[PDB]
Amino acid sequence: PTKATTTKLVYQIFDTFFADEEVDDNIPEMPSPKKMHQGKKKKQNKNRISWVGEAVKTDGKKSYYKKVCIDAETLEVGDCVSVIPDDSSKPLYLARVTALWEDSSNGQMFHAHWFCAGTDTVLGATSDPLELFLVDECEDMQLSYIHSKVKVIYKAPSENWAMEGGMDPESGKTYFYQLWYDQDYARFESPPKTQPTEDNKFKFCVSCARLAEMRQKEIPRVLEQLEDLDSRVLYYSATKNGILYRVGDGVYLPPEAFTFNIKLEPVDEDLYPEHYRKYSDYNLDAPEPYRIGRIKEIFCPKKSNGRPNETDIKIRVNKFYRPENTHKSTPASYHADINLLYWSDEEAVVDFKAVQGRCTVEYGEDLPECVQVYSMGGPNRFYFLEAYNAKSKSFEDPPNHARSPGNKGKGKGKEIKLPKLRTLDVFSGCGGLSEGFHQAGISDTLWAIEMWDPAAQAFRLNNPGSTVFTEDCNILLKLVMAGETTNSRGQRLPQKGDVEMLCGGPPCQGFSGMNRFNSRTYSKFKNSLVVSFLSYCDYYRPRFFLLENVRNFVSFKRSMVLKLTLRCLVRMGYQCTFGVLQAGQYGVAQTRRRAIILAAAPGEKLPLFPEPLHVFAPRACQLSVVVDDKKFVSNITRLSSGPFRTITVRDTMSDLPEVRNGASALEISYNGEPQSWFQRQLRGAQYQPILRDHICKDMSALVAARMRHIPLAPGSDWRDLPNIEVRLSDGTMARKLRYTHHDRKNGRSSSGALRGVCSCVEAGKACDPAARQFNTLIPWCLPHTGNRHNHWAGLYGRLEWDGFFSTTVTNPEPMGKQGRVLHPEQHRVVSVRECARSQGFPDTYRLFGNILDKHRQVGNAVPPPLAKAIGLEIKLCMLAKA
Amino acid sequence: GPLGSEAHLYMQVQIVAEDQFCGHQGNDMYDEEKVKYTVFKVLKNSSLAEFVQSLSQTMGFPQDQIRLWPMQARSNGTKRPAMLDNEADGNKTMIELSDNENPWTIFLETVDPELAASGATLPKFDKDHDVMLFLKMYDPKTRSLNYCGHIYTPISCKIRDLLPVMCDRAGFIQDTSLILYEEVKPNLTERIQDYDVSLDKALDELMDGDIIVFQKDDPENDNSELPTAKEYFRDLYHRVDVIFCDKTIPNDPGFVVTLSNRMNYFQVAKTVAQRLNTDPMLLQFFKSQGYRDGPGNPLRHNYEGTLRDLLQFFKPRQPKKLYYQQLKMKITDFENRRSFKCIWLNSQFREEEITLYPDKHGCVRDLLEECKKAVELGEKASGKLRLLEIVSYKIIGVHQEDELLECLSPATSRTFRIEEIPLDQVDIDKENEMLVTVAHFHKEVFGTFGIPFLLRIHQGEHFREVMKRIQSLLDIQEKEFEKFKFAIVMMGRHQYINEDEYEVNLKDFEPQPGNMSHPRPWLGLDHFN
Ligand SMILES: [Zn+2]
Ligand SMILES: [Zn+2]
């Protein structure tokens, strides 16, 4: 069982290399990477340089040739050359000759399209020393700089690439390349397809063409004008960043864009001896969601020579009110749909630069679809049914000029459905990832692998048309490579061509430390489930590949797990990338950062990362990754804002019936209506007589007493516990915590009472074992080790209705590390149903086993909303391949 | 049911006449539910001409005296008469003219038989330059629509020229000032501001079957609750008939109230309370199950949705029901009731499962009061109730009636029992008589069973009198009682008691001095079952 089943490729990768959130980032941030080929370089002394043949084309000052000769060695366009760095530094600049020309103004010249050293990518020392990567980085250069003509080949994927999995590398040593490389986003992709015309055929450079495309795409320009006035010029449509804005379309704006006309004790230290540990706790909240406006006018002011200034494109818009923007304020958001708005006759002018994207905002009644069908049918959809008057603080029917001019619906007078990807989910759990993917509409998970039996059972329950294997993944892969059709119990094994999508979350246990690999830990990682998973990838060759893990995956063993993973994927010939996502930004109230590794086959398009749907606390939204002193971000363009309001605990579980500590009832009545959009989504439109798995752990009488003595005020934890004698449910007596020592750091109470519970406060490192205290309402162990663990903030803490879950764990313990588990009002730990709600699980999603089993199943699961977002991002790529 | 060998070769052609347009108070021409058709089962391959012959002969008209205007659906969801050329399209199959639609509805335009006996015939219609407009008159005073027939008119005709027609078709004095709207669709009635413009310009996407609504321009209209046709069609768009039913009443047909889609909880509750002559707070509402007919989720008093939200999952065909029940307490107090499952012990010493709903903040007293309201007591007993707590078939305690209900956890092994106090336990001699906890057990004392109970104890009792008292309670077999092994249990130890020695006094039942906190000695019986 120790040795991991592997392919010769992967095994070689990890053999030829030979020689629990520690919150690796609160960041001394870096500008990062800094296009690399900037600066000077060493020129070469060449005795003879002459143009072979005659000029193929002559232009304004340049004269192009097909082939040149340097010191008796010929050199054509399309060849590759080596140039020497001015610094004594080792990297040897490599380029492709895209054009050769004589410029009487400047001299004998060529255009160098640079390669990137594999060791200068994210791969680092892991990279094949012979591997190069296409970049956008090119420059004109005098021929004299050329040191040598070097050979570079293109390792194109074979026409039989999808079956080359498991084949041995026997199938000399030169420079080669197979992938283009985005340096900011760390994206390895297939080489760009952009073709030359035949007029530039000789001088054609791909980097120049892509630079052209890009810089042309991102200059905002007005399109077709429709009215000229004395001070300004009006247009029907403007365009920016590839997206087109007509008059009447919806527009995203920063909260800074416009404003709405609406008018906007000492403690007893005897009774509360540990409250002082909160005074060091006395964090920016979640941002406002996008302002939403409707484009009324698109205009450019004249320069007052009488001609329009098109650098100064401006938009006049109608303001939309979110329910929380009205006089009813924040509580108006509780019941309302997240996409619900109100029309207003208020207007505002903003720069076209401030526009953060286009949205669809319709009047709900003119919709052919029902409102929710419309809401769930596309990415950026809002609707309104009424109009708000801030002056009268009232609501009325929308004006007629607000019902979009486009659909009258009379006449002239006088939906691409993709086949779902067959998906293999390794280390599936109860199947949250597969759930979200099923919701994306891209996958049918036909095979799953989970060693833990209850989770496997759950997956079976939620996916009856699939085959769940409980055997070790290694012996299964071994079975398949041995040409076996089935396992021992007769379950059909997946074969090459069956698996179209591979997804999973491999356990990192035992290499999960931050510091560098030794031979031991590397021996453990060498046979880890990560290598097994990558072996599954290499063998099956799916169109798409997802590896999800804890965030610190990108920082494990100083990012070597990540680097080796990426390197292996590249070796397979995959396009690949990595990133970090906060689940809270995608429709749940939780803080749950995940490391996401994406990969696509050569014939495919590499998926982007999902653009954040919901605003969220900035502290929980640090998505960037530092690898070998380079900062890597994802393609995500939304930093400070988002379309939708943040989801809260109130949104999550306010509709659930009040239960009590150790609630055992598996089937109970909801006893009410869904009170929120979120609840409406997770409960569905249809009546539900039975609510399942609303159940709580049964805490000891002591813990129950403590819990019921935690105040309801936001920010309450164990530090608000009164020190008092309590009569426990079992008849036991809870004695007051005695303070037997003077605490140096924390000093003395106003009363002059001692704050130490033990000798170890004097750094003497003794721990008088006779001084340990038991059965106290205020837990001795917390002031014991308080000073070293940030005063144990959050332990025995209550959730806030307006707040969010700390990362949903497998076994909520009030004294655990994640330990603010308590219900905002009732005295108990959160129920299984509530945790599932915090994970974005549909209430009809089935779990299995005893209560701890279900808690664990929920805890280890990927939040289905997140997986849904990623899944849609993949759906785009499925559509794009034509 | 059973199809037929060539039922698939036929199609329904539903003919509607203009008389069905009169009286319609809603949008478009007619109500689909209330309309009376003349139905034809016709071969799909039948020509238009054949159907015109058949129709003309069947309904009694000359073929040149009728015109067919197929009822055609628009994108907005409306359904209006469209143009059909009897000559040009006469040779086409009915199924291609219907565009595979079936049933296929057609408007039948004929000349008024009372104006045709006088010699008039069917007017000519130019497909390219003419249009057929339908005219409605809105009366604000009665808040109603009056169908004013249709007209053929050139597209280029001016709105101002249609006014005399509208006037004399509605019985208006000529040169009466009129407000004109186009009924574009439900919830879209658009006023015509300029009467000096042609029909083409005035009406975007001008088609045959378009509807112009008109009313008097008169200050009196502001006394109506629906002064304009716009507001009329708006209020009509949001109008809905709700059937309120009491969930307690079996097969309650319920009562129908006409309400608005926009109404909140407060307004609805007020309305129903009015038609029921009660305080709104004394009403609890239930959303419908909606696939099944029956009460669904209960509504909180603070429910922030509207009536439309409550009725949205009903089909437009379905009757829209809303459930409710009348309360004995104001709905907030009713929402603060605590579901408390416990066991009721009767006069017959038999256990029943009961669930009571005392106030969540109440005391044991309130629970006992509920249980007293729920049951009947013995012919004569105390009439006073009490609350026992039982675990492992053993009574682990009695709860004083002032104790808080929030301090009780009706858990798995924890069973709360309520029982009427026996007469000889109400008032006893405190330093003489003592109440002892009694339980059954088979073999050893860990395994326990049966119904535990509280027993009175005298002084120097003569133990078999106490056992004939026990026996007087139990009453199972008549000296199978004899096999009872009597024991005193304390901290797991047990000493059996000799039945004929009669050793009894309180001292053998209290714990050590000043002791309450840990379990008190109890009486044990052995006999199995
Ligand atoms: Zn270039
Ligand atoms: Zn210590």
What's a concise summary of this model?
Chain A has 882 residues and is an alpha+beta fold. Chain A contains 16 helices and 38 strands. The longest helix of chain A is centred in the C-terminal third of the chain and has 17 residues, at 864-880.
Overall description:
Chain A: Residues 34-46 have a biased composition (Basic residues). Chain A: It is found in: Nucleus. Chain A: Belongs to the class I-like SAM-binding methyltransferase superfamily. C5-methyltransferase family. The complex is a heterodimer of chains A (882) and B (529). Chain A has 882 residues and is an alpha+beta fold. Among the domains of chain A are: 34-202, Bromo adjacent homology (BAH) domain (SH3 type barrels, Roll), CATH 2.30.30.490; 221-264 and 283-402, Bromo adjacent homology (BAH) domain (SH3 type barrels), CATH 2.30.30.490; 419-648 and 865-880, 3-Layer(aba) Sandwich (Rossmann fold). Chain A is built from 16 helices and 38 strands. In chain A, a hairpin with a 2-residue loop joins strand 4 and strand 5 (73-76). In chain A, helix 1 (8-15) runs antiparallel to helix 9 (560-572), helix 4 crosses helix 16 and helix 8 (529-540) packs parallel to helix 9. The two termini of chain A are 44 Å apart. Chain B is 17% helix and 31% strand. Chain B is built from 12 helices and 25 strands. In chain B, strands 2-1-5-3-4 form a 5-stranded mixed β-sheet, with no helix packed on it. The two termini of chain B are 62 Å apart. Chains A and B meet through loops of A and strand 14 of B. The site of one zinc ion has 4 residues of chain A, from loops.
